[PDB]
Amino acid sequence: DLTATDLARHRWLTDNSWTRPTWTVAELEAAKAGRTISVVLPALNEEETVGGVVETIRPLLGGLVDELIVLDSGSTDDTEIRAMAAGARVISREVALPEVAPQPGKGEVLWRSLAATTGDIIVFIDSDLIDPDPMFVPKLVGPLLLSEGVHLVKGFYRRPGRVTELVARPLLAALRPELTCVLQPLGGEYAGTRELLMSVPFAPGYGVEIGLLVDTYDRLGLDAIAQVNLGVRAHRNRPLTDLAAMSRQVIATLFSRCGVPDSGVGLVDRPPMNTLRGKLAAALEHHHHHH
Amino acid sequence: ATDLARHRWLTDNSWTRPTWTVAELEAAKAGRTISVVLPALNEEETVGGVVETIRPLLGGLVDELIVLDSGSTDDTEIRAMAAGARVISREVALPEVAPQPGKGEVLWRSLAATTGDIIVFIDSDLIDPDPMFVPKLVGPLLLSEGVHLVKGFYRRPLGRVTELVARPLLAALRPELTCVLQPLGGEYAGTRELLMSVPFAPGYGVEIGLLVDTYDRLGLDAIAQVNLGVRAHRNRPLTDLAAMSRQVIATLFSRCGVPDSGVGLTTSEVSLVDRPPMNTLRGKLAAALEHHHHHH
Ligand SMILES: [Cl-]
Ligand SMILES: [Cl-]
Ligand SMILES: [Mg+2]
Ligand SMILES: [Mg+2]
Ligand SMILES: [Mg+2]
Helix, strand or coil: CCCHHHHHHHHHHHHHEECCCCCCHHHHHHHCCCCCEEEEEEECCCCCCHHHHHHHHHHHECCCECEEEEEECCCCCCHHHHHHHHCCEEEEHHHHCCCCCCCCCHHHHHHHHHHHCCCCEEEECCCCCCCCCCCHHHHHHHHHHHCCCCCEEEEEEECCCHHHHHHHHHHHHHHCHHHHHCCCCCCCCEEEEHHHHCCCCECCHHHHHHHHHHHHHHHHCHHHEEEEEEEECCCCCCCHHHHHHHHHHHHHHHHHHCCCCCCCCCCCCECCHHHCCCCCCCCCCCCCCCC | CHHHHHHHHHHHHEECCCCCCHHHHHHHCCCCCEEEEEEECCCCCCHHHHHHHHHHHECCCECEEEEEECCCCCCHHHHHHHHCCEEEEHHHHCCCCCCCCCHHHHHHHHCCCCCCCEEEECCCCCCCCCCCHHHHHHHHHHHCCCCCEEEEEEECCCCHHHHHHHHHHHHHHCHHHHHCCCCCCCCEEEEHHHHCCCCECCHHHHHHHHHHHHHHHHCHHHEEEEEEEECCCCCCCHHHHHHHHHHHHHHHHHHHCCCCCCCCCCCCCCCCCCECCHHHHCHHHHHHHCCCCCCC
């Protein structure tokens, strides 16, 4: 028999998931209604791929996309100069947020990018993608521009993911089962409103994606979360040591959000950016637990 | 200082090259008896091969050799019996308790169908069993003091649930237990004193539940591990591994008091309900098995 989780998933997929997100660039630009869109590529030593990702987004710059930033995390290869030649604005962690010393990890980069961007919508795309497609950004922003109440859009790939299927999804089933409807909770391609992203803490390192997903859910529920199919992509092979470290941080971040203490046996969470920037901006929509 | 604790446990409680002979282990039994239990559900292709590696010990080191069948419809029972095991159904093991599915149920029920002071569990689906498995698993129980649970591990040629799920969760919630190389392994031996007195987690949670309960109740030095040899990882489909992971999570959460929704993976089987210590249902058997000097 269907569970409450099953029923919620069915209707959430009907309303908030797009397998064929075929909005046109023209109709999305027309829907902006004065809102601006920033695209951020976090990057650490991605010289072979960063230019290719920038190249797929560059045609939107000056139309759908208002700024295209590579937030470099201290590369020692040619990541930064290749991003420049490909047509992006390269900003370091230190320039993005001068008053806070950096610490390692991807979450730090995305958090700092909130201070370096101005868009009402911020889109994150990994800089290590081997086969980026030019429609990633349109598909990610579609629900934010057209679907009332959506604040976070997760881009997923159809397959022709061990941490996702063995760690993230089973832990969500135990701790936040409604979120098992999200196909790829750890995915690096996603978009959010400034109102949402400035109001939540950012988990460090490999925990950033899952932390944003759970913080959004705990604040707004499933209604605020959407997902879109970015296309067919094969799984990329990562070393087991990388996967184990990713798993351990996914666990730590889930535990910190879900009331589970953690030994610390294996970086700190950053506070909402609205404690440092945009301090008087309008608050994220209320979602009351009392009446 | 914490890696120091793990390093010292490895020095005293882990054996990469157990030296023990069958003869020296028999000489050390000192009146203790050993029961070997193989859980089996539809393992006709491998069960006989596993039994054949243990059968030569029967009447010497090993006092009984049982396959606990969970309702096979293939030729598991006849092949196990032909190879020299006594085949016991779940119903025979514990007749007045209705069976429920999963591996934990089978191991728990076997406690009511055995008499050993030591119980050794060996999986019946092993493709490459070796006759020294039982000797290696019982070595620390017979020759060391204070050991109650011995976990058999395999060196790998130079799994994902262990490295991505079990070990990182133990780092978070029972940090000393990351010293155990293969916490989910199905080859292990325990004392009657331990096994008769702990609840048994259901299904794929049984191994980690026993490990954590032993750690909490009896301590790190009550756990040991032994290398059974080099074996390649077995290829299991991702949906099986994900279901196993979900139950490992549920059982660990149960042992920590973390509220677990009980919701499976789109739907995999998840149970949050243990079986109670067998000494509650077989009190006279349990008391008969308790050594006269237990509380002395
Ligand atoms: Cl993954
Ligand atoms: Cl495994
Ligand atoms: Mg990289
Ligand atoms: Mg313009
Ligand atoms: Mg630099």
